[PDB]
Amino acid sequence: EPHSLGILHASYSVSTRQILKDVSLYVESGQIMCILGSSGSGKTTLLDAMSGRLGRAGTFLGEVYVNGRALRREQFQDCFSYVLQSDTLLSSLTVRETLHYTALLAIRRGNPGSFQKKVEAVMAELSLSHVADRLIGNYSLGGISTGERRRVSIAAQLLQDPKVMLFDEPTTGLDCMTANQIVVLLVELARRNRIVVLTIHQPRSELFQLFDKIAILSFGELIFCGTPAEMLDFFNDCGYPCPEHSNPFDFYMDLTSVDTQSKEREIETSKRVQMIESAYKKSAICHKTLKNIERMKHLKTLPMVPFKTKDSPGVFSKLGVLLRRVTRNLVRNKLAVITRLLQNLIMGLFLLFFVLRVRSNVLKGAIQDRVGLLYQFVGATPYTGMLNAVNLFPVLRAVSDQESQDGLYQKWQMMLAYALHVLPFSVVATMIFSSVCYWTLGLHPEVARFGYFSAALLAPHLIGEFLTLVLLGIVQNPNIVNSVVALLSIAGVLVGSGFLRNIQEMPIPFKIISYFTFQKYCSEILVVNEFYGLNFTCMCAFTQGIQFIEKTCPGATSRFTMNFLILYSFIPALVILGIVVFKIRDHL
Amino acid sequence: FSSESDNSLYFTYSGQPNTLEVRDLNYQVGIQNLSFKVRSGQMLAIIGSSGCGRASLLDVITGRGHGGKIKSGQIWINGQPSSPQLVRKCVAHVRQHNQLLPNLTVRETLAFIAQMRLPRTFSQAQRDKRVEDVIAELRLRQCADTRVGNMYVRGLSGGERRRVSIGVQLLWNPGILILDEPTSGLDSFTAHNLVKTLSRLAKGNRLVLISLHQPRSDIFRLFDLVLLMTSGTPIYLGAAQHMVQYFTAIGYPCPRYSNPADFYVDLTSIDRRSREQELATREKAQSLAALFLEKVRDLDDFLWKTKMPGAVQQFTTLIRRQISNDFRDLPTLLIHGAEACLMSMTIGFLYFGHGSIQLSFMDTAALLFMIGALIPFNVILDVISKCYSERAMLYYELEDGLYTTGPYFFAKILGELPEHCAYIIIYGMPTYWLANLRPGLQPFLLHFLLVWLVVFCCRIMALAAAALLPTFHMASFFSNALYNSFYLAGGFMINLSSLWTVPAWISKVSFLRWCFEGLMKIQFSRRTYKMAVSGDKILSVMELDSYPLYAIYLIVIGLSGGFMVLYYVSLRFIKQKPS
Numbered sequence A: 001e002p003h004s005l006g007i008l009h010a011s012y013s014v015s016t017r018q019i020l021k022d023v024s025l026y027v028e029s030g031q032i033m034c035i036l037g038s039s040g041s042g043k044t045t046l047l048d049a050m051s052g053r054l055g056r057a058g059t060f061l062g063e064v065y066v067n068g069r070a071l072r073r074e075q076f077q078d079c080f081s082y083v084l085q086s087d088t089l090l091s092s093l094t095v096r097e098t099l100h101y102t103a104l105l106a107i108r109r110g111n112p113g114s115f116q117k118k119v120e121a122v123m124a125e126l127s128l129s130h131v132a133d134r135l136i137g138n139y140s141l142g143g144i145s146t147g148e149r150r151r152v153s154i155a156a157q158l159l160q161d162p163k164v165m166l167f168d169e170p171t172t173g174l175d176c177m178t179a180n181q182i183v184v185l186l187v188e189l190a191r192r193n194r195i196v197v198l199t200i201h202q203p204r205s206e207l208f209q210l211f212d213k214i215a216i217l218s219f220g221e222l223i224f225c226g227t228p229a230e231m232l233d234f235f236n237d238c239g240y241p242c243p244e245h246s247n248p249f250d251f252y253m254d255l256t257s258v259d260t261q262s263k264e265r266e267i268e269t270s271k272r273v274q275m276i277e278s279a280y281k282k283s284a285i286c287h288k289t290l291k292n293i294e295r296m297k298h299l300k301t302l303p304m305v306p307f308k309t310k311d312s313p314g315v316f317s318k319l320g321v322l323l324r325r326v327t328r329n330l331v332r333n334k335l336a337v338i339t340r341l342l343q344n345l346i347m348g349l350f351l352l353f354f355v356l357r358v359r360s361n362v363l364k365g366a367i368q369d370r371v372g373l374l375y376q377f378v379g380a381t382p383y384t385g386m387l388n389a390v391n392l393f394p395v396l397r398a399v400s401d402q403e404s405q406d407g408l409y410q411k412w413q414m415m416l417a418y419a420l421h422v423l424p425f426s427v428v429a430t431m432i433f434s435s436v437c438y439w440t441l442g443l444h445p446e447v448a449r450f451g452y453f454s455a456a457l458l459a460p461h462l463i464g465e466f467l468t469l470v471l472l473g474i475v476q477n478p479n480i481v482n483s484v485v486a487l488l489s490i491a492g493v494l495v496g497s498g499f500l501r502n503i504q505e506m507p508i509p510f511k512i513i514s515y516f517t518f519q520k521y522c523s524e525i526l527v528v529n530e531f532y533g534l535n536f537t538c539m540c541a542f543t544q545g546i547q548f549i550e551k552t553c554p555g556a557t558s559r560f561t562m563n564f565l566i567l568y569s570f571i572p573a574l575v576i577l578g579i580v581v582f583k584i585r586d587h588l
Numbered sequence B: 001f002s003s004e005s006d007n008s009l010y011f012t013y014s015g016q017p018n019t020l021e022v023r024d025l026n027y028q029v030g031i032q033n034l035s036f037k038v039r040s041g042q043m044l045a046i047i048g049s050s051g052c053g054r055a056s057l058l059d060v061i062t063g064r065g066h067g068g069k070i071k072s073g074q075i076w077i078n079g080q081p082s083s084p085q086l087v088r089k090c091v092a093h094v095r096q097h098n099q100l101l102p103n104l105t106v107r108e109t110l111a112f113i114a115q116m117r118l119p120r121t122f123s124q125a126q127r128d129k130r131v132e133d134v135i136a137e138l139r140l141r142q143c144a145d146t147r148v149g150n151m152y153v154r155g156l157s158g159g160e161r162r163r164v165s166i167g168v169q170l171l172w173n174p175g176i177l178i179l180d181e182p183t184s185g186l187d188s189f190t191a192h193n194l195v196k197t198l199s200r201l202a203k204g205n206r207l208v209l210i211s212l213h214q215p216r217s218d219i220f221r222l223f224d225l226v227l228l229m230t231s232g233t234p235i236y237l238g239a240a241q242h243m244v245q246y247f248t249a250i251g252y253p254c255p256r257y258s259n260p261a262d263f264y265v266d267l268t269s270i271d272r273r274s275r276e277q278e279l280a281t282r283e284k285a286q287s288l289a290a291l292f293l294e295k296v297r298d299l300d301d302f303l304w305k306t307k308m309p310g311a312v313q314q315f316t317t318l319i320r321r322q323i324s325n326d327f328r329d330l331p332t333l334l335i336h337g338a339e340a341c342l343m344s345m346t347i348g349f350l351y352f353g354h355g356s357i358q359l360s361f362m363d364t365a366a367l368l369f370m371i372g373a374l375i376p377f378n379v380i381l382d383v384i385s386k387c388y389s390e391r392a393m394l395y396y397e398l399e400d401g402l403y404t405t406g407p408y409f410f411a412k413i414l415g416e417l418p419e420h421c422a423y424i425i426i427y428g429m430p431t432y433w434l435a436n437l438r439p440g441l442q443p444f445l446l447h448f449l450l451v452w453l454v455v456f457c458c459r460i461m462a463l464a465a466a467a468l469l470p471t472f473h474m475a476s477f478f479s480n481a482l483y484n485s486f487y488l489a490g491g492f493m494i495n496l497s498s499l500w501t502v503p504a505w506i507s508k509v510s511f512l513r514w515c516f517e518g519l520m521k522i523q524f525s526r527r528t529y530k531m532a533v534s535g536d537k538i539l540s541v542m543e544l545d546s547y548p549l550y551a552i553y554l555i556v557i558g559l560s561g562g563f564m565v566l567y568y569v570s571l572r573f574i575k576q577k578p579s
């Protein structure tokens, strides 16, 4: 099985400079290739070229051959594994769980018993079967270690059994031992009929005699590619021996990078680069590469199928994975469930701290106190719902995005899972809040009064959280979305509800943009639940409560059935918008 | 090879080589036992293990480390025992991650510091000589007149920021200049040429110390003295070009085509993943240390092979440097200008009292309360946000001691008023005109001034919360609690007379209530109001009668007064830890 990966040519440009030039490479099964390069080498870009994770953002006129056969742009994700240099794992799941849910998202055939065989399988090869069933958690002494995180991520990519594995700087944030351990782990994986191609920054001296092929890019041009033996010979024949106690990586890297501190040394070192690069293109090792790749094209010895193997479970089965994947992340997390359920009760206890009872006397605050409580609720109910999203969703976002490119699921399938498990807590949370201070405030004690009130504020509590998803889908920094959403709810209740500006006498646009606030219909509901059955005692204008319901939101008593259906219809609107907003995120 | 050019000295240290020696230091969380004597003219680089109580070593020697205490051992600086005075007087510390102001130039950043570091007895020409002399020695004669923008992105490069960061210590001609990770993030070519710029600094009769993790191969050839460690126990100290010989002769010699530094750093490593792994090589580290101190126990060195600027002048220097930076930051101005404008029109147009029907009474009360109660929403977040951007700067400036909490306290409160006054005008005047408010210049100004004081009072509040709580999300939560409290007890959303005793006194000191009660007294003071009715029983009905308008200004100034007392005590006693 001469299983091989090649690049007949490779080029890539943005718009309008270019980033890669005639990158021609050839790696066999069992070889671990190392790609060095200075900043702006595009070595990070070349890995993305093979895994096909660029798509069509620029122009690629290269050819990627696998098993003597050319690949279409649509079959690059269909063969290659690719892991990022900073692995994002949900912190409230164990390693078995993380691998279990990963295993669940990758295969469509059944038998859950043999899934525990494969989840257990990949934990043996990577020395994590020791720490399976253990919580991942935080850093070294208070969770799982750095290298173990790297191996959990390598396990998640091994569950799909890719035949080519591209690693981006896997030894960046690692110790002298763990980064060496990962290089050791990577060189074992390749010798097991697998292709491992990785890039390294500060390659320590020991790593040199361990890689099967080392190649250097400088501004997209391939300077060298060969074995460490072939390399030492080449630059010696070019006229640059390795100094006595110098790391050949530290030496040839400096030798083939472009110093830019001065106009004179940029012209100088580039003149030196052009001699080394051009002398390489005329090398025996360089033409040994191009002679090999098309030797692979016309040898009909081992043609093959793309790997990873395209078995895809449906959407309804995948959401169920992510639904219990995220819910177990939230409930196993003790802090967040408490905060998610109680911050409405804290909001309500703070108001009740300031105003004990309502007092039914017009002169001691019969309506002044009533208008305030409903404004604070319609105003701060969407805010607390938003705090849920800007605090707990950005981490689940980074998980979704890593796994969305890898083909576990599409980004929108993440928020729908998220959309659904916040439903029980939010419904319970506003009942924690209503049941406590409604009766204590003493608003209006009929049981039906309380029932509507609870539901009426569940919608802004869901609306404010769902709006924060659709924004976080296209705004990255959650500190901004926190600033945005809070501005919109302060704008929403200040305009939409007739409280602080009578909805009838305000200028035309504020009437217009009123009909689009979810606050308008919420208040029209809540202004009825209290002021309908009341009568006052005592300047003293209003005597019975139906009069104030007339002064603002007139006729709203007739529209009570419709005003609930409207208010609650925004919830399915945001979820649908988010789905489309996250398919736009798919391309940014 | 890299680069060759001028290597002449321009700025040297005019004193005798002051010495630093340490005899048997034991520190823990750390370091077990070290001994050496260094002199000016030398440059000692430490190699050691990765973050193994040695990036804390230059903090233990300066006496300013944390997570432990010096447990035994003596530290001598110029033959004198270590003390924070000798550390402030001798050792110029270059912090790896420090901030400079982004919209100043290399001359300006050095000059503002030079007017606070050189003695008062220096003329401006002498101080200008020292700035230019530092620039020329650090090869910054090129690019001296450019902005040192970091988030302003475009400007000087990372090697030049570092060069400017060292100059901020070279300005007062130190004898002992210690650097922590000078080659962090730097280019191979840049890291090499920066080490030479330090080699010339030690040649300028200075004692230059370097903590440095995994050196590249070219940089190891540029060390003079070198200290190789494994954790808290030292392995070898001496001339760099003989580290191969010392170690070839003691039985773990150094292979070909391998950086000795990253070869021997791994040679004494102690791993932690197993009880027997960590058992074995701490036995190797303590054993290997046990045999170098006697190979140089009989050999000495353990070497193998003026009145200052006052409070006023610093106020003058800080208030300039602050105001000089923030008025070149045109992007944040235009945005903070529009966030006032676009808002002052959102309020004005909802209550537009002209081309329609006149403002209702309760419509006029909501407007006045909102104008005051809506301003902290923007004011709190950014006043807090500006402080936390400066704590990286504020901490090392107040620690090294080039100014006291005194001057900065007055510099911090006044450098924002030039900005503050524009922000209020853009926010205050448009809302007054759009909504049909009580006409005349006299009402208009009193309206403007109370809002100016309330927002100023709020600045002093949010400014004080930022220096008093450890982190942003706690300071943000604390000022939002005050704001939420001052909003409820503001006196519009709830009745003042129906206040629980503590919300009753919360209202007494809420500057959001005095804004509402004041502006309600400016509009409805003496005018008769059109349904007419005189404004007075109107305000008496809403308990806005007592506390005449002028008291409302005194009270609000008193509220900002108390906050100032909070803020000065906060700065002087609560240290301002970054991040």
Ligand SMILES: CC(C)CCC[C@@H](C)[C@H]1CC[C@H]2[C@@H]3CC=C4C[C@@H](O)CC[C@]4(C)[C@H]3CC[C@]12C
Pocket: A488, A491, A492, A495, A513, A516, A517, A518, A570, B342, B346
């Ligand atoms: C789909 C709905 C529920 C989202 C929330 C309501 C949206 C559509 C409404 C409610 C309040 C409105 C904002 C209120 C005030 C202004 C001031 C104006 O100078 C710019 C537009 C802006 C910022 C409005 C934009 C539209 C707006 C955000």
